[PDB]
Amino acid sequence: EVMALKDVREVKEENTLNEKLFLLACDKGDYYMVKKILEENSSGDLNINCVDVLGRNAVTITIENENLDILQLLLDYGCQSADALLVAIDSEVVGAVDILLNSTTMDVAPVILAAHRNNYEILTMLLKQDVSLPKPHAVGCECTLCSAKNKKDSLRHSRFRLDIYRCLASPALIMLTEEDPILRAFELSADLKELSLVEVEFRNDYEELARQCKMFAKDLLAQARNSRELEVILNHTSSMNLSRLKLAIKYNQKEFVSQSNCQQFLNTVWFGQMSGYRRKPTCKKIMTVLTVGIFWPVLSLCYLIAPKSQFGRIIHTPFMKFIIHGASYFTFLLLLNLYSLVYNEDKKNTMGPALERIDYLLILWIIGMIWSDIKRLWYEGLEDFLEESRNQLSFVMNSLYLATFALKVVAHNKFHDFADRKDWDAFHPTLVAEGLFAFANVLSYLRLFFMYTTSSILGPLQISMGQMLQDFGKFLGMFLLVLFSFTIGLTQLYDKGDCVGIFCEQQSNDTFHSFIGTCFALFWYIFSLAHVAIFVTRFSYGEELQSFVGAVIVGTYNVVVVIVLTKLLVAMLHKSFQLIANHEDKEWKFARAKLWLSYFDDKCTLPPPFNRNLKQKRDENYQKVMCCLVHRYLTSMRQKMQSTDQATVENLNELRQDLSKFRNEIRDLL
């Protein structure tokens, strides 16, 4: 028993010896016997289109060898091309492509393949002729044209769309045919990201194309020499304001923002006229921060009285504006803290209390904060407001504050009978008002987290935790399902059975007598700190089987949560933090730039408590700077391909081909 190997499919036909001689002389550069064989071909002894073992014709063989003279000789004898231009384009040589203008999947073109290989000279000499590429449809287009080609060949339609978007996302085509390469890179990265979101099967290619566009935009920004052209590119309006930087923030260009030139420009705009703060010692820095933060209402009122002069100019600096806003929020938190100390004046027994001075201060403070939030809604969109978590947290905190003050004034108007607090009902409006006040205090002090993004030490850590909270959500779903299952089981088993529940000195068996009680009891089992003792799993009338089964169920739940799920969460956090920490600086710089751009504008200056010829000249300046950046980028990147690309086996084969050419020339001459 031995398998006998046989060639199932015929691929190479030998036929006569002249075809093999032509194939052997094609990959050896033997010019004179090649022209003799071509003269015999003109006589008619052999066929020009010869298929070898590799399936490559003589034109393909001489294109792989990158030889122009013998290729010109082949073209002068009327050889069949058969998409040899694509093969010459893929081998990335100028001469073969320009002499062809004098397998591969059918949806591509010479322009598409030239953009795929990212060859600037091949693209710029294929763009001398008029070339138009088919405009792809939008990511939400479902017209009859899009509903007819997919039925015929969905795979061909998807590959054609991917090839079109890969041709458009090439850097060299962005240089050659677009007025604004920066805006084209931004919009193309956004479109490729939303295509990766939509096209779930091909999301890796679209993601890498979006990354390629973003890297191209970053490395195009990196070619700026002086700060004048940097302010030219970063203030351009498509049709001071920093419109292009705002567009880069909007289009999630994290690499563009975290560029050192852009970061230095952001620092210079952010510190304003106080450029010596960066070179100041640390003690002077804390002293400056403390001095600007202590007399913040003086600066605010002095800007309110006279904005034009120098005392209204220091607040106009976004760094001092941010410090004033931070001190404003800190004294708001101080008022929240002092509410408890002020309120201890026998006002804990009144049904509807009279509002103190702190209450009037706090209602003024949250009216100012609500007005600031309303201004942010009216100025910069709605969905982008919902994107950022501080805005949602502040909206919920302000809603809770509004409900608190509404319930407080309702209780003051209606419930104004003095009594003791022990005799009140559970759902009295005052109690609900103070509960929502406690929740709003929690959220107000938790809103201090997003002032960490401007710190160089606590910034990237907070950004990493905010990035890794999605792992907690995705695992929270699974834990909620497991908790629901064990809650159903324990409630079903234990429903047959003063202070009731687990919030007692002696936690009775009645904690498992209800569904919400069972969820409460199994919720305090996660921490493994004996918050719910094991005698709550004992029946009150000595049912040993049911109590033991409940104890086994609780033990299985404790194993599955504590010893399995918590360690799994630790492992997923390990992988997430190892992936996240590679680019934590870039995300921190992007978030800090967003926080700085939130303070750059002059429309929201005062803190929460106190609250054509020019277009053509700009277009000409931007076009000149863009042409300079294009030239610098092209020379730089061609230096990188000449200096960093490693040699291949094809280079060695080409060197052997040149050596055999010289050997054959010496043989023929001598």
């Binding site: 050192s260 201890n344 559970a426 109690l431 938790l446 606590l458 000195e505 933090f577």
Partner: protein, 499 residues
């Protein structure tokens, strides 16, 4: 220039510093390439601190300068050349080694040749100690440990005697200092072992010979602060710990003499701010700090050394996460205090707080709320502390929900985040554990190289020569630079990547 063009100025400064920090220019055109590399790495580190942008460029330039200094030290093929290099001063001192430690050259210091030189100067007149059997080493170290005071009084009465010169060996001096500190901790342990006195004098068995040791520690810290400045004193965390413990010991001594000459009665009837009680509490805290200073001795050992160094490196990340946890804790503490301070009661209770058998008034004040939320990490706060005596189920539910939210956010979220983040930190810092451990161990070694401060704590209380030194150092630098540029060309033409 910055007002006219800041980007051009920054690029020009970076280009100039890139040109100056190149190894070839320093090897070709600098008088002292080692001093140039050290100072250049210092300026590039300071510029990376100042220039927030281009921080990676200046850090890479500083690392390149340090790597060049390490390679220039690598070309020493004789011990005479190494002794010329390490002892050179610009104006057996090891002045250049001290300069490299000052400029934080971990790779230069942890080079094996100067490591061997420092080990030879460490085991002074110790034939074959590095190859001895381990329990024999332990027995001999124990023997020298019990014999610290006889060597100390031998150095007191006869420094020229061989017995008085045995303490001049740095390893023997370190052993005697560690034995002294162990005797101090033994006296601290004996202080607790084996009153109603309002004006209790120090007992003669233990506390009377504790006082001269405290004076010796204070005088040693003062001498260390004088000789070296205050910047290097605040750079070391162990010096800060020693200063804290000496301040606590001085406060304990002052409170004891105050309670002796004033406020001269059963123990249970004393004031809660009685000076004797404050003195005992500060003595206990100082005892904790004194016994926690023993972890600094782990650096000498080759097994616990890198581990202790890695834990010290991760302490900074510990504090960085503790800031975030403290913000969370203040948030939830103010929320629970605002919810629960209306239900504050006395009721004739002997207890008010979370620190007894019946836990009550957990969130009545902000201090008690902070304490109760602090002890919820370790699960020492029971679930009934969120209950009020009134029949207000809504406020009890809100308090239980906020307590559970705080418990989740701390224990499930932030503790596991901290576990993953220190996992990554220990993965990052274990690659370079050996060089930082060797740097810290060499700092510990030349802490004992100087002649001053030889005694342990209880007993502690011209032109032609310089010209020939410059000629010798210049000839050694010529040989080292020639070898380095030769190796640079060798390694450079054997770069395994072909473009």
């Amino acid at each position: 220039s910055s007002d006219v063009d800041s980007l051009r100025h920054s690029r020009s400064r970076l280009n100039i510093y890139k040109a100056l920090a190149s190894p070839s220019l320093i090897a070709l055109s600098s008088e002292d390439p080692f001093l140039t590399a050290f100072q250049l790495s210092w300026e590039l580190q300071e510029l990376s601190k100042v220039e927030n942008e281009f921080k990676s460029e200046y850090e890479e330039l500083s690392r390149q300068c340090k790597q060049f200094a390490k390679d220039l030290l690598d070309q020493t093929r004789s011990s005479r050349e190494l002794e010329i290099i390490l002892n050179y001063r610009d104006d057996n001192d090891l002045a250049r080694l001290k300069l490299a430690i000052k400029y934080r050259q971990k790779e230069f210091v942890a080079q094996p040749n100067c490591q061997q030189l420092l080990a030879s100067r460490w085991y002074d007149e110790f034939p074959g100690w590095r190859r001895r059997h381990w329990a024999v080493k332990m027995v001999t170290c124990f023997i020298i440990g019990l014999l610290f005071p006889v060597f100390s009084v031998c150095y007191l009465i006869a420094p020229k005697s061989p017995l008085g010169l045995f303490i001049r060996k740095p390893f023997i001096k370190f052993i005697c200092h560690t034995a002294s500190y162990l005797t101090f901790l033994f006296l601290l342990l004996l202080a607790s072992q084996h009153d109603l006195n309002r004006q209790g004098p120090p007992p003669t068995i233990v506390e009377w010979m504790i006082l001269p040791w405290v004076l010796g520690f204070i005088w040693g810290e003062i001498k260390q602060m004088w000789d070296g400045g205050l910047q290097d004193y605040i750079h070391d965390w162990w010096n800060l710990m020693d200063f804290v413990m000496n301040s606590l010991y001085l406060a304990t001594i002052s409170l004891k003499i105050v309670a002796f000459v004033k406020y001269s009665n059963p123990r249970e009837s004393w004031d809660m701010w009685h000076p004797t009680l404050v003195a005992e509490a500060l003595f206990a805290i100082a005892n904790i700090f004194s016994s926690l200073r023993l972890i600094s001795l782990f650096t000498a050992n080759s097994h616990l050394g890198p581990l202790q160094i890695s834990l010290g490196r991760m302490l900074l990340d510990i504090l960085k996460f503790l800031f975030i946890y403290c913000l969370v804790l203040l948030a939830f503490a103010n929320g629970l205090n605002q919810l629960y301070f209306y239900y504050e009661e006395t009721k004739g209770l002997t207890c008010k707080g979370i620190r007894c058998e019946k836990q009550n008034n957990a969130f009545s004040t902000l201090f008690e709320t902070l304490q109760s939320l602090f002890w919820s990490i370790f699960g020492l706060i029971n679930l009934y502390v969120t209950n009020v005596k009134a029949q207000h189920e809504f406020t009890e539910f809100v308090g239980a929900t906020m307590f559970g939210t705080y418990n989740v956010i701390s224990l499930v979220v932030l503790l596991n985040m901290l576990i993953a983040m220190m996992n990554n930190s220990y993965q990052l810092i274990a690659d370079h554990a050996d060089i930082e451990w060797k740097f810290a161990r060499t700092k510990l070694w030349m802490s004992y190289f100087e002649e001053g401060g030889t005694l342990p704590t209880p007993f502690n209380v011209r032109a032609a020569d310089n010209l020939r030194r410059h000629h010798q150092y210049q000839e050694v630098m010529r040989n080292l630079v020639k070898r380095y540029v030769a190796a640079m060309i060798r390694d450079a033409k054997t770069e395994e990547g072909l473009t």
